[PDB]
Write a protein that binds this ligand. Sequence first.
Ligand SMILES: O=C(O)CCCC(=O)O
Ligand SMILES: O=C(O)CCCC(=O)O
Ligand code: SF4
Ligand code: SF4
Ligand SMILES: [Ca+2]
Ligand SMILES: [Ca+2]
Lengths: 611, 611
Amino acid sequence: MYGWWGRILRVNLTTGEVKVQEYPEEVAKKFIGGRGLAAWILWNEARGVEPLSPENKLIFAAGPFNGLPTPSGGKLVVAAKSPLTGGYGDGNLGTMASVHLRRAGYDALVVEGKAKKPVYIYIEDDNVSILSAEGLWGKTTFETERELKEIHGKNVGVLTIGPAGENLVKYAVVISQEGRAAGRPGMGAVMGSKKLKAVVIRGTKEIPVADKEELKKLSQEAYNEILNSPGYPFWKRQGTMAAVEWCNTNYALPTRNFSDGYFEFARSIDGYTMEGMKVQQRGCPYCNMPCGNVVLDAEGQESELDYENVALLGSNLGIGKLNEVSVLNRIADEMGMDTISLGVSIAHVMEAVERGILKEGPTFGDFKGAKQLALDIAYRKGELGNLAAEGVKAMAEKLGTHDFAMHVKGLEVSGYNCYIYPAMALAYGTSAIGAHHKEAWVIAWEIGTAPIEYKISYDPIKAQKVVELQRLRGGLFEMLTACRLPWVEVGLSLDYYPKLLKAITGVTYTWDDLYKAADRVYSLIRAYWVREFNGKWDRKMDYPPKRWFTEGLKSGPHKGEHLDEKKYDELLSEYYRIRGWDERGIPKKETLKELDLDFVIPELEKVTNLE
Amino acid sequence: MYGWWGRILRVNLTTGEVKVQEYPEEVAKKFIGGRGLAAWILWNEARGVEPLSPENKLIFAAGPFNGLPTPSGGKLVVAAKSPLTGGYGDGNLGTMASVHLRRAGYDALVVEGKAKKPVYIYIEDDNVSILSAEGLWGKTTFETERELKEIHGKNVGVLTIGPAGENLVKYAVVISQEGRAAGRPGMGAVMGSKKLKAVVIRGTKEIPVADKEELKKLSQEAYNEILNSPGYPFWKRQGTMAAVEWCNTNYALPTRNFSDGYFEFARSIDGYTMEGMKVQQRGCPYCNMPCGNVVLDAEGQESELDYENVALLGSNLGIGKLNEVSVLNRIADEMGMDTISLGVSIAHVMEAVERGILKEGPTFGDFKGAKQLALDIAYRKGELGNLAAEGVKAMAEKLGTHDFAMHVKGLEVSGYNCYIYPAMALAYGTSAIGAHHKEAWVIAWEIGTAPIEYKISYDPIKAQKVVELQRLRGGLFEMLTACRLPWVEVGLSLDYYPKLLKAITGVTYTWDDLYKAADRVYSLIRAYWVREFNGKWDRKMDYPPKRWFTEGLKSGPHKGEHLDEKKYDELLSEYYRIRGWDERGIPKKETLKELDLDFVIPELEKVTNLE
Ligand SMILES: O=C(O)CCCC(=O)O
Ligand SMILES: O=C(O)CCCC(=O)O
Ligand code: SF4
Ligand code: SF4
Ligand SMILES: [Ca+2]
Ligand SMILES: [Ca+2]
């Protein structure tokens, strides 16, 4: 076997037992890795279990691409049954943990059970131990990693959670190298429910590559393509921050709980501003186009800014000062909590206050008030903090504010307001893990322009794009697993991947073979949601926030415009027609059979009638 | 006598003698104050003196508006025969030292001679002493003021010099309240040559006011007008920083030693960027539209930004990040040196390195190298820091680089590139104190738009608008002396100034009275220049830098466009005709008499032939 190790390190914090699981090569080829392997493991190992119970599984899934020097391939997936959604949840992050874990002889690491007290996992090649972390508990992500490296050395990849993860804040994430995060659906709160404070990994093994010479050839070639791309220079200057002005220009910038798509103070939180405030630039391993743009916040503190962070914690909260937003950014990072859901849950809170629905809390534009709630959310201090820490879906059920509850399947919506963007809306509506732009960033194609540089329509070809995009973004790249920005941003050729995959694993994959795996992973994940939801499922699960229907843009040429329920629904059907799912959103026996997923049928058959 | 005290404080550092000179009421009425009063003094007392010798007079001249609550009337002028230009030089700065000086019973303070050791002047009403400052010498202006306040309390006005003054950097200035500055022509280098480290003032006296009730009402009315003007909200947001975009939009932004009028990275150093980097806002005494905007620099240090600082230290140096320009900004402030002349002297070096004339030194964009040269200049470290500390005119004489020496009369050009702006060019060419935009910021009128929100022409009416602007900017406002911005930026009616003066001094000044007074100040100063230049003088002293005539814009639709000498010469002649000067730029006998300057004629007649 080449590329894959075919080994999965298993760590039980309840029994303290550490073993290595050897899975079949066919399963490697079948799911390639990352989200694929993760999906495979959760179907089998996380059946009907509570997301915060010790029976849940936390998976750090890598891919054949990881551990080896491949263009921006130092990513990693973190999965487990989500405490936020209740279905499948996963995330990605660039970190040396990815390089060191695969070089330590593992394709993934699964963690079950829960420690009786705070602990951290230590992994150095074949030496794996569960050590006491009693002294780290309570510390920020930054400090935790720093102290651990002060002990073991700089040559280790470190994964940690902050108080937010510790206090089981619903959308807690996992952090690495101060800035890289993973797991919006609550991978951090799962890690936290297990009293697992961190993970330190060190690898030195030589990974078996089928064709060594071709890997160096392809990689070296892919880098140069990236370096000479016309988009390199600008990317290097603004990274994802360049979407701020772009989204404002297109009325897609979420402002005050997605109320409007235009923020009057975009310019003071935009990319050029970020540029004149940049003091450092970091990146994930093996990437020659770093986009970890670090600035100094309002308190002179370093803060790594990303578009999604600035949009949900900036324009979305009515705060138009980068130095200030950056302060909220840094807090989410050290507390270990998703910028998007945090910024969305606080925005939700801000509107309920202006509506007089909530007696107290910060309102739009209140920076100091927002900073306070964020910290209270992290430490779950106060009734409000404890509520906003549960996400907008849950918080809304309690308050009775589903009107402006911006989520899908439980997960809070990203930074693209789709009042007049059907394909993007459908992308949020169908995301495999809940509202997120990860899998289908169709908005750029839907408009015709891109940040690196209009008529509404529900043409059923839009659904086709989403599906095609999902296959690559929420599929191929979430399985290799590698960064998709070299392609999405500077236009690196997608041909390098099938060729690199063959140079590594020695297996030849046709783009059609890959689409199948991606479509396979999507039907298995959907299957998971259904099984876990106990057959309680219908096409509405795939619906965008009601607000994109009953309300409209509040300014500009498209003032008053929005999405239409009928045409959206008709577009959902096209999506289901292309995926092979029934009108309920569930795969059909022919599709499950067709995708090598027969074992799923009897199981879904036990919860509902299949088609 | 009302308004004026008719009293001037005299301190002789050499002999230590301290007295109070009484000056006539026609002298006050005649010259009103500030710059008016300073010119009368310099003409009489700084005859033939070495700008850096003990005989030179350091004047701190206030006016009828100072010491009283007048709209943004907390200004003060600093004058002396200039060390950089060799002619009449002066500056203006907002400082509590303006209020306290007048509340102590003085209209102005005149330091002469030279202390035998570091000393500072202490003033508290009638108690005036020359104290030892031996423990202060060497410390930054910021630190000097903080330390003195820790001793005498916060309720005082402090004026200081930094090591640039101490070391006699030719464009050394006087600083106050970290940020406020005065004296581009080297007032700080004169303060330093006297071994004078600071001046602490405190006043408690009540100033005689002709009409107490009117002054109140007029002031209350002026502030509200400011508060309600449409441009107020935006002025509060960007201050003078709004001039970067607007200047870039008009090809007026000095870029790489005035090489171009456009900067490709202007955005990351603009008012919107600044806006999102703002942590504090300060202002001068008695102003309800504060504009001292404080940002955090690349090093986390507070920096007070003003358009001119960012233009000559940013885009002019080819440095496109605002946090890095702010760093250079802070250095200027704490070292006590004019941001403008420092930036121009540096850009000149940068262009000199690039062209290979200089074998060592920084280049455009080299922030680290510019910061080092800036510190090397303040401390006069090395042949380079030493040459640069002399200004571009002197530096150019040494390097033989007259071609890209951006100065007029020895004083370096401001933040407005005039390849295609004949009025502004005439403004710099005729500025009383040498190149500056203080007296005539005509560029806005010439374009038809202003920052608070094209065909080249040499219409002789342009020479009229300059003279008109000078009467107000380089006259009325430097004599009162009050801030011009409330009128210039938000548009406060200029009609409050003649009424307020009247309500304070009791005298009725009509606009023609003011135009005559300002004109007197202009002919007197020119007189000073000619006399001190020993009759060696001609129209070329009023010419803009050669670069704008033999080179043109390098980009945009005006690419290649430049200024026509012949047509400019004609514009200058219209200027001399209007002012009543000969084709040599020297006042005409009939003109002097006309302005009550007969006493100038016998004196000038000793060096040249009058007309
Ligand atoms: O700006 C974003 O959040 C998305 C960047 C492009 C991508 O998702 O691939
Ligand atoms: O932007 C500047 O430097 C000038 C502001 C307007 C004025 O000079 O009055
Ligand atoms: S482009 Fe950005 S997210 Fe992608 S690998 Fe490079 S630094 Fe990481
Ligand atoms: S407008 Fe600015 S410079 Fe003028 S008095 Fe006010 S704070 Fe000072
Ligand atoms: Ca980040
Ligand atoms: Ca200043």
